[PDB]
Structure 1
Amino acid sequence: MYLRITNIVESSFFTKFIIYLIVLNGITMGLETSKTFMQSFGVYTTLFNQIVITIFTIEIILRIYVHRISFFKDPWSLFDFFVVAISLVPTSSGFEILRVLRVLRLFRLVTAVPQMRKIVSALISVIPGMLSVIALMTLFFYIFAIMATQLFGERFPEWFGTLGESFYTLFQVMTLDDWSMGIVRPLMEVYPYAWVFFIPFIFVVTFVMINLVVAICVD
């Protein structure tokens, strides 16, 4: 019966039946957004939901017999497994991010369809080339975030009071987001020289960031 199912799983039909459900379950999840819609056809789509979820574990069980070890060394398969696994954790208990994390299954449209896989893969592949830089910056952020916490967090604890807060504010400054009118002019009414911290910070981070784009434009 093994080859019987290896023929079912690998069937163009099967993969297209899968892609058909993703597009349906996605259309259905956007409808679950409507407080109106749920009052009318809520029970329709709760069931439609549990239905698709079963079908998906059935596939994943089926997909594993056909592939075994090869399957748990496939990124896309591992993914598909974990994204359905999330979707199996009861509609209750623990955290309710798990209910919300269920919509991650629409990323299966990326998995199940090539060209997407190509594109995602194309993208992901650029990351290893960025890791020396990314490491550098994260060291850098860590260093300034400490500096900022101990220089400004007493008077400005919303923004710098804690190591994590400083990470966040520094991230915001880095996105050049509302940084002057929002953070540093305020800081300067108390610490006139705060500009000496944030201007060099900005330079380094924007400089570095430009290089990283130029590096991604030579690989």
Structure 2
Amino acid sequence: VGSVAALLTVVFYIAAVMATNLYGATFPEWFGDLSKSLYTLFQVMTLESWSMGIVRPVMNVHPNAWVFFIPFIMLTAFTVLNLAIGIIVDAM
């Protein structure tokens, strides 16, 4: 349960380091810092305005940006579901 929470934090950093590098120069408001990126990657992870607000505008410059976001969305959604079930196990 704690192993999952640690793994996510690790993944989230590598993701926000990568996103900064890839989209930072072109999209400074969302990916211009490691911190600006950590926030957007959290916003995308909760799914709030992920596509119409972030992904679609990013793709008008980087047409393959979906290769980054869609997996990140699937990965974090699986990690969160795995973390959600881990709490249920601790009960039973």
Structures share fold, TM-score greater than 0.5: yes
Percent identity (aligned) = 63
Which consecutive segments of 4 or more residues in structure 1 shift more than 4 A? none
Q: Partner letter of residue 73 of structure 2?
A: I
Q: Does 1:133 align with 2:4?
A: yes
Is there any run of 5+ residues in structure 2 with no aligned partner, and where?
Answer: none
The structure with the larger Rg is 1
Q: What does residue 82 of structure 2 align with?
A: 211
Q: Does 1:159 align with 2:19?
A: no
Deviation at 1:218, TM superposition (A): 1.3
Alignment TM-score, normalising by the size of structure 1: 0.41
CA RMSD of aligned residues (A): 0.7
| Distance across 1 between alignment mates of 2:51 and 2:33 | 21
Q: What does residue 199 of structure 1 align with?
A: 70
Alignment TM-score, normalising by the size of structure 2: 0.95
Question: Bigger relative contact order, structure 1 or 2, given CA contacts below 8 A and separation 6+?
Answer: 2
Q: What does residue 190 of structure 1 align with?
A: 61
Q: What does residue 42 of structure 2 align with?
A: 171
Deviation at 1:131, TM superposition (A): 2.1
Q: Partner letter of residue 194 of structure 1?
A: A
| Distance across 2 between alignment mates of 1:142 and 1:172 | 14
